[PDB]
């Protein structure tokens, strides 16, 4: 509990008295802590003297911020136009029914997390199912097990 009060109070120091900078001030506490706890946003609102409602609105308005602890291995499937026309939706729904967890949430013990992203760039090797480390070019319906057990 005390580990989350000065790390956030120190990353705000180079922004005091400067207009703007809540989008970056959070992208840093996200990269450090993995997520944005309520204590984090509370101290950001205290230090910047910005309203807590505004901080929570910006923290929940953008996709790449996670207010709850994200997993230790993200399972970003590509729901881009190229993957979807190829049938990535099938891969997404099977990783859904396989981890048994809801669409955009973490496992019960913080091991995996499903995060449907935009194009990861491999719009040639479609569909791509990145498992937090590297691309995965083909990912037919049967090749999802041989990776989800490996990275855990």
Q: Please, are residues 50 and 24 in contact by the beta-carbon 8 Å criterion? A: no
The rounded distance, in Å, linking the Cα atoms of 109 and 64 is 21
The least distance separating other proteins from the CB of residue 37, rounded to whole angstroms, comes to: 10
- According to DSSP H, which parts of 14-148 are helical? 23-33, 38-48, 52-61, 81-86, 88-99, 145-148
Residue 126 partner contact from ligand FES, other proteins, none using kind-dependent CB cut-offs of 5 to 8 Å? ligand FES
Phi-psi bin for 121: left (phi > 0), alpha (psi -120 to 50), beta? left
Residues 6+ apart with CB under 8 A from 62: 23
Nearest to 47 by CA among 81, 12, 6, 4: 12
Q: Which of residues 54-93 bind ligand FES (CB under 6 A)?
A: 78, 80, 82-83
The rounded distance, in Å, linking the Cα atoms of 19 and 29 is 19
Residues engaged in binding other proteins (CB under 8 A): 38, 41-42, 46, 49, 51-57, 60-62
Residue 147 partner contact from ligand FES, other proteins, none using kind-dependent CB cut-offs of 5 to 8 Å? none
Residue 41 partner contact from ligand FES, other proteins, none using kind-dependent CB cut-offs of 5 to 8 Å? other proteins
Q: Which residue is nearest to ligand FES (CB)?
A: 119
Please indicate if the annotation marks 89 as binding a ligand: no
Residue 44 interacting with ligand FES (CB under 6 A): no
- Which is nearer to ligand FES, 8 or 136 (by Cβ)? 136
Please indicate if the annotation marks 100 as binding a ligand: no
The least distance separating ligand FES from the CB of residue 96, rounded to whole angstroms, comes to: 17
Which residues sit in the known binding site for [2Fe-2S] cluster?
78, 83, 119-121, 123
């Amino acid at each position: 509990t005390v580990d989350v009060v000065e790390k956030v109070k120190e990353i705000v120091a180079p922004w005091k008295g400067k207009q703007g900078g809540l989008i970056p001030i959070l992208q840093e506490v996200q990269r450090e802590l993995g997520y944005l706890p309520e204590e984090a946003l509370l101290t950001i609102s205290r230090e910047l003297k910005m309203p807590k409602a505004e901080v929570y609105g910006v923290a929940t308005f953008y996709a790449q911020f996670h207010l709850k602890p994200r997993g230790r291995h993200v399972i970003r499937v590509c729901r881009g136009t190229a993957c979807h026309v190829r049938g990535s939706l099938q891969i997404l729904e099977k990783v859904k029914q396989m981890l048994g967890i809801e669409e955009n949430e973490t496992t019960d013990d913080l091991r995996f997390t499903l995060e449907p992203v935009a194009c990861l760039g491999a719009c040639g090797l479609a569909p791509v199912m990145m498992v937090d480390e590297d691309t995965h070019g083909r990912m037919t319906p049967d090749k999802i097990q041989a990776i989800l057990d490996k990275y855990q």
